Amino acid sequence: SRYKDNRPLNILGIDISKMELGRYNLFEVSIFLQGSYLNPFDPQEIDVEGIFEDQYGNQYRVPGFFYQEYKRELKNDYEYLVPVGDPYFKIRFSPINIGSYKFFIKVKDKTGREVSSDKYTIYVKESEKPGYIRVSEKNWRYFKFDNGRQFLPIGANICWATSKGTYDYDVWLPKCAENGGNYFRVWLGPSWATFALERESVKEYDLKNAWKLDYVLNLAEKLNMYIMFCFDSYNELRYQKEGAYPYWEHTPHYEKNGGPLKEPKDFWTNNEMIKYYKNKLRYIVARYGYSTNVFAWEFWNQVDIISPTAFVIGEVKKWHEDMAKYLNSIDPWKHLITTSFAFSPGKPEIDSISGLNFVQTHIYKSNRYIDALLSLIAYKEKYRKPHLVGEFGLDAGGNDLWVDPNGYVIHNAIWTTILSGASGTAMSWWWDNHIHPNNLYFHYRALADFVKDINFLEEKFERLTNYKFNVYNREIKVIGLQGKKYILLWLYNAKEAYQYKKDIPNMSSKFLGSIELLIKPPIKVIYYDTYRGEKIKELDLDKNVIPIIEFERDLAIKIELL
Ligand SMILES: OC[C@H]1O[C@@H](O[C@H]2[C@H](O)[C@H](O)[C@H](O[C@H]3[C@H](O)[C@H](O)[C@H](O[C@H]4[C@H](O)[C@H](O)[C@H](O)O[C@@H]4CO)O[C@@H]3CO)O[C@@H]2CO)[C@@H](O)[C@@H](O)[C@@H]1O
Ligand SMILES: OC[C@H]1O[C@@H](O)[C@@H](O)[C@@H](O)[C@@H]1O
C-alpha cells in the first residue's frame, strides 16, 4: 500500500491535453485528487471514470488509472527510469465519431463518497486513422479496420527487450516497419518481462513497466504498427520441476511470494485471484484501450502447458468465457480477444468460444513444416473466424539460430501461411538473436510488396485445387490461392526448400516446366523473385498453361484474370 491516501475525497486539478483533435486520436485527461484508498489499482478502493458522449447519443464510460511519469536514460547497456513528480490519475479516450463531445469526471472512493467535475466540451475533426481492427464481415478469414480497409498482419513476435528496454524497440520497430511490417506481439507477463504489470504483486501494477509499454505503443502509433498484448504466459503457472522455462516458484500469484494462490490450479477459481485479475483487465483497458494500435487482447501464451496439476479444461474454458465477457463489457472500443496454445491443433473446447474473436496456432516443427502449416490452416477453417499463426520456428530449442542464418525457415513459413488462407504471416520467434542481427527483414519486404495491391476481402480466395504439374526436371510443389480476379502461387523445390546451407539465391531465364489451371484466358502472368522482392518477368497468355521459369528454391507467381 505504498500509494495509500486517507483524506476526504476531492478533485484538486484537471489538465486536458487538447480541446481539438482528430478521429481515433488520443485525448488525455490528467487528474490530481485526494481521497481514502489503500490501493489506487483497485476500483473498490478508488474508482475514477470519465463519461464521454458524442453528438449522436453514444456514451463511453472510460475507467481511469494510476500513473507515474518517468524520464528514461540509457546507462550504457541498461535502461534506467527516473520518476518525475508525484503520481496521479489519468483518463485516456479516443473518439470514434467526429463532431462535438461532452465529458465529465466521476470519482468514488472506499467511503462511498462520490465527487464529479463539471462538463467539458471538445471537438473532433476527421483524420487519416483507419480505426480499430475487427473481423471482416465480408470474409471471416481476415481482419479489417473500421474504415473497411484490410488489416493483413505482417511481422514477428517482438515480445520483450534486453536490459536496454525501450531503446531496443527504438531499433527493432523502425527496421520492421520500413520492411513492410505492421504487426508485433508483446508480453505483459511473467514478472521478468519488459512490460510486466504484475512484477512484484498481483494486487498493484508496476508503473515503470507500464510507462515502457506506453512508450512502445506510442512508437507503434508513429510507425503504423499494431500490437497483440499477451497478458499472461504459461510459465507463471508451471512448477520448476516441470521444466520449459518454469516460473511458479517466483511468480507473485504464489502465496510464498505474497499472492493468494497455494498452487497454480487455484488460479481459475480463487475468488481473490479472479477479483485481482479483473482489476488488471480494468487497468489495461484504462491505460491502453483507447489505442487503435492495440490489435488484440490475448489472455494467455500457451495456457495448455501450465502445470498439468493446474489444467482443468472445464475451468479454463469457463474462465476464458467469463473473462472475455467481462473484458468486452468494460472495453469501450471492443478490441479483439484471443488466447493461445502450445499444442499446434489447439483446444477446440476453448477455441470455439464465441468471445474469442480469432484462433491461433503455435508450431515449432523441423520436418515438412510447410505441409504441417497447410494442414493446420485447412483444419482450423472449421471455426469460421480468422486464424493467426502466432508463433513459428524450426525448434523450440533454438536450433534456427545456427542452422538457418539466412532465414529460409521464416521465408518458407510466411509464404506458406499467406498463400494458404491464414489471416497474415506466420509470426517468427527469435526477433532479438536472429531476425535483427542477421538482418532478415528483407524476407518480409518481398512478401509485403507481393501482396500489397491485393484486396483479400474481395477476392473470395480458395486454396488452389485443380492444377496439373508438368515438370520432369524436379519435384516442384505449389501452395496457391484462386480468387475472383487473381491466382497467387508459391512454388517450391521440395529438395531445396528444406536445406539451409546455400547462399541467398541470386538468379534467370530458362524454361523449367508448366502448370495448367482451371481458369479462362486471357491472363497476365507476373513472375516474382521472393528474395529480391522484384518482378522477374511478365507474360501475356492466350491459354491456361503457365510456364514455370527456372528457380533455385522457390518462386512466386501472380496471375491476373483478364
Ligand atoms: O532471456 C529473457 C528471458 O528468457 C526467458 O526464457 C525464454 C526463452 O529465452 C525463449 O525465448 C522461449 O521462447 C519460447 C516461448 O515460450 C514461446 O511462447 C514458445 O514456447 C515454448 C516453450 O517455451 C517451451 O520451450 C515449450 O516446450 O515449447 C514451446 C513452443 O511449443 O516457444 C519459444 C521458443 O522455445 O521463451 C522463454 C520464456 O517462455 C527466461 O529464461 C527468463 O528468465 C529470461 O529473462
Ligand atoms: O537494439 C537491439 C540491439 O542492437 C545492438 O546493436 C546492440 O546495441 C544491442 O545491445 C541491442 O540490444
Q: How far apart are CA 200 and CA 327, in angstroms?
A: 24
Q: How far apart are CA 197 and CA 285, in angstroms?
A: 13
Contacts of 416 by beta carbon, 8 Å cutoff, 6+ apart = 370, 373, 374, 426, 479, 490
Q: Provide the CATH topology of domain 133-459.
A: TIM Barrel (3.20.20)
Residue pair 211/198 in contact by the 8 Å Cβ criterion: no
Residues at CB less than 6 angstroms from ligand 1: 192, 233, 235, 244-245, 301-302, 342, 362, 364, 391, 396, 429
CATH superfamily assigned to domain 5-125: Immunoglobulins (2.60.40.10)
* Ligand 2 site-directed mutation target among 171, 435, 438, most atoms within 8 Å of CB: 171
CA 362 to ligand 1 centroid distance, Å: 12
Ligand 2 atom closest to the Cα of residue 161 is 12
Residue pair 440/434 in contact by the 8 Å Cβ criterion: yes
Which residue intervals of the chain bear CATH 3.20.20.80? Answer: 133-459
Q: Whose CA is nearest to atom 9 of ligand 2?
A: 168
Strands (E), 152-223: 155-157, 183-187
Q: How far apart are CA 327 and CA 305, in angstroms?
A: 24
Residue-by-residue DSSP string for 352-414: T-TTS--EEEEEE--SSHHHHHHHHHHHGGGG-S-EEEEEEES-TT-THHHH-TT-HHHHHHH
Q: Whose CA is nearest to atom 40 of ligand 1?
A: 245
Q: How far apart are CA 160 and CA 432, in angstroms?
A: 9
Contacts of 289 by beta carbon, 8 Å cutoff, 6+ apart = 62, 92, 331, 332, 333, 335
Among 346, 359, 360, residue whose Cα is nearest residue 304: 346
Among 63, 33, 47, 67, residue whose Cα is nearest residue 109: 47
Q: Whose CA is nearest to atom 6 of ligand 2?
A: 437
Q: How far apart are CA 434 and CA 416, in angstroms?
A: 20
Q: Provide the CATH topology of domain 462-561.
A: Immunoglobulin-like (2.60.40)
Q: How far apart are CA 470 and CA 483, in angstroms?
A: 23
Q: How far apart are CA 343 and CA 385, in angstroms?
A: 19
Q: How far apart are CA 558 and CA 216, in angstroms?
A: 36
Q: Whose CA is nearest to atom 7 of ligand 1?
A: 245
Helices 408-418 and 369-379 cross at an angle (nearest 10°) of 30
Bridge partner residues of 5 (DSSP): 37
Q: How far apart are CA 556 and CA 532, in angstroms?
A: 12
Q: Whose CA is nearest to atom 22 of ligand 1?
A: 244
Q: How far apart are CA 287 and CA 297, in angstroms?
A: 13
Ligand 2 atom closest to the Cα of residue 170 is 1
**Residue type for position 455:** N
- Identify the nearest ligand to the CA of 163 by its number: 2
Q: How far apart are CA 287 and CA 301, in angstroms?
A: 21
Among 23, 12, 44, residue whose Cα is nearest residue 131: 23
Cα pseudo-dihedral 50, 51, 53, 59, rounded to 10: 120
Among 69, 29, 63, residue whose Cα is nearest residue 46: 63
CA 168 to ligand 2 centroid distance, Å: 6
Helices 166-178 and 207-223 cross at an angle (nearest 10°) of 20
How far out from the chain centre does Cα 524 lie? 36
Q: How far apart are CA 7 and CA 60, in angstroms?
A: 29
Q: Is the peptide bond before 308 cis (omega within 30 degrees of 0)?
A: no
- The DSSP H or E segment spanning 7 is strand 5-16
- The DSSP H or E segment spanning 174 is helix 166-178
Q: Whose CA is nearest to atom 1 of ligand 2?
A: 168
Alpha helices in 207-252 (DSSP H): 207-223
Method underlying the structure = X-ray
Residue-by-residue DSSP string for 401-445: HHH-TT-HHHHHHHHHHHTTT-SS---BS-IIIIITTTTTTHHHH
Give the Cβ contact number of residue 514 at 10 Å: 13
Q: What is the resolution of this structure in A?
A: 1.6
Q: Is the peptide bond before 547 cis (omega within 30 degrees of 0)?
A: no
Chain breaks in the chain (C to N over 2.5 A) after: 507
Give the Cβ contact number of residue 132 at 10 Å: 24
Cα pseudo-dihedral 464, 468, 470, 473, rounded to 10: 50
- Identify the nearest ligand to the CA of 162 by its number: 2
3-state secondary structure of 21: strand
Residue pair 527/554 in contact by the 8 Å Cβ criterion: no
| 3-state SS record for 478-497 | EEEEECCCEEEEEEEECCCC
The grid coordinates listed for 355 are: 468471445
* Ligand 1 site-directed mutation target among 163, 188, 245, 395, most atoms within 8 Å of CB: 245
Which residue intervals of the chain bear CATH 2.60.40.1180? Answer: 462-561
- Identify the nearest ligand to the CA of 172 by its number: 2
Which residue intervals of the chain bear CATH 2.60.40.10? Answer: 5-125
* Ligand 2 site-directed mutation target among 78, 162, 167, most atoms within 8 Å of CB: 162
Residues at CB less than 6 angstroms from ligand 2: 162, 164, 168, 171, 436
Pairing of strands 462-463, 523-529: unpaired
- The DSSP H or E segment spanning 459 is helix 456-459
3-state secondary structure of 503: coil
Maximum Cα–Cα distance across the chain = 85
| 3-state SS record for 116-151 | ECCCEEEEEECCCCCCCEEECCCCCCCEEECCCCEE
| 3-state SS record for 290-309 | CCCCEEEEEEEECHHHCCCC
DSSP state of 452: T
Number of C-alpha atoms within 13 angstroms, CB side, residue 137? 4
